[PDB]
Amino acid sequence: AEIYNKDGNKLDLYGKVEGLHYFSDNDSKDGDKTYMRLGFKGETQVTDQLTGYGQWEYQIQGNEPESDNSSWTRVAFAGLKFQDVGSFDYGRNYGVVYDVTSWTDVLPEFGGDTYDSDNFMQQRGNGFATYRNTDFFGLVDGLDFAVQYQGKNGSAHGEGMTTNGRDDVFEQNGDGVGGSITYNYEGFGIGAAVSSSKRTWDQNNTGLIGTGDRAETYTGGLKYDANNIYLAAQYTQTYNATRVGSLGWANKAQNFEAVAQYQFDFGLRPFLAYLQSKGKNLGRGYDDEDILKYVDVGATYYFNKNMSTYVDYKINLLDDNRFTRDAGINTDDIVALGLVYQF
Template sequence: MKRNLLAIAIPALLVAGAANASIEIWNKDGNKLNVNGRVYALNYIGEKAKNGNDEGDKTTARLGFTGETQVTDSLSGYGRAEFEYNTDGVKEVRYAFAGLNFGQVGSLDYGKNDGVLKAITGYTDVLPEFGGDSTSYVVLGKRTSGVLTYRNSDFFGVVEGLSFAAQYADSNSAKVAEELSSDKEAYGLNAQYAILDTGLTVGAGYAQTAGDDKAKSYIAGINYDANNLYLGAIYNHSKQDEKKIRGVEFVAQYGIDFEVGRLTPSLAYVQHKDKSSGTNRDLAKYVEVGMQYDFNKNLTAIVDYKINLLKESKSPSDYKDTLALGLIYQF
């Protein structure tokens, strides 16, 4: 029972993308506390965009913790908080949630957490710096405040590799999508299946807002992660009244191990289109070429080049090609 409990509790705590490395600072009498942090020294180099947001220093620092307390053999509590600062001192509460884990029955938590569709958008949100555009175009595709989330792994212990989640977002605190009018209640669910030992995972999700002008989002994805090769692809479709947004993202990465460290080149294609009536406008369209070098689990260097394919006359923000250079220290 304890093994099954941890199998669900740990993904519940880390689902929002905690650092790969963390420090355990307390483990006694069924209580655990881990601290994680990251300093991301980052600079964007490129032709300055009209909005002035695409070049210069992007350095950030994060600090967070995850905790767990064992109540009984089949019940535990957990929580997570994470904060981010940039070099201007601006603070963001990235995660703040707490919940209960009932073993094979599943887990339930509330607070600021990943939207339920982010589990699928994450299939392609693996690039060194860029990517993750789909989170702006789907309901509950990004970090969201005031969400109540239920998660279940291995389908109550009956089907290994089959997991699902359901989520409710409070209208008083949730911004559930950027490109849709969506400051309102929302509901969503996802399902994922890791197919035996093949390295293949397939997933799909649906989310919608409440009200007469409800926004709806559908998403499906697949990834392969084995033999040093990672491939990921997603398709999403959102609509609200006459507005329709469709998008595709494809990612390929290959890890090359050295005596010291690991080099991972990446190649990606991203396109999201406004397909509303009488409209056929690209919202995002680019090719990404990048690489990261992991010296160890704590230190990573990245180079990422975004080749923008938007035509200037159709670009909503007039973005240009951008090169990102960064060094990450995390614990």
């Protein structure tokens, strides 16, 4: 909620409490999943053209006991925006791949999981320098593009080290570049995004699958957002980029997400979806294996802009086999029941 607006600066303090509960035969995905998010979006007017901004967003689990409570920063960046020239921001933010893949990431709780956080330039991560452009310098109504750089986030100790080092190799990344082009026009949307990033020595020399000099992704996306209907689909091909449970990464992966939603006037919003992640030439005798594969069904009911409830049902199509057990990937169904307050 916009709690402050005076003399050029305005601040939006926003958050939600998500009363959430998972039902699953997988005990590790069964139980209380309640959490809270808090954040601010700031905006200051510098000149006629220039404006400065800063966003921060934070998650604090609400399903843990008081002796040990986990929380983390989702985004934290600051930037400048100049009318018809572009914007620049730096900090923890979403990678440019997400500019397109986010069109399918629209379900209440599940979905958007053919990629993780801190997964190179595919979603949220540290050290993003991002240039964005709206309506191609104000000339083409609806044509947006972005060029982004991510600086190396290395290990905590030894060489290949950075000030913000991290022992988990799945959260590390070398220097990377990516970009995206988006075009919307009266309901329709065509999108593309490419990214390439050096992989660190640690994530290429600890006996994991899917090693190589670079982690790369290629994304294309379609959508339709009008007349109470939402349809979307994204296709992304990755190399040494998609995480394969605990085993490592997939040398090659073909990701597909599709979503269909409808919005009734009285507040109900059913949805149907299908996600899939096919790994190819994984090595170590695995060959071609589904990393992710599930239908997702359910509905959200909006009481209000501030209150909603939902049922989100993940029908897991993965088979329980030696590959999935070695990686520790969930093959069981999950039902998420939500009750959410926002402001």
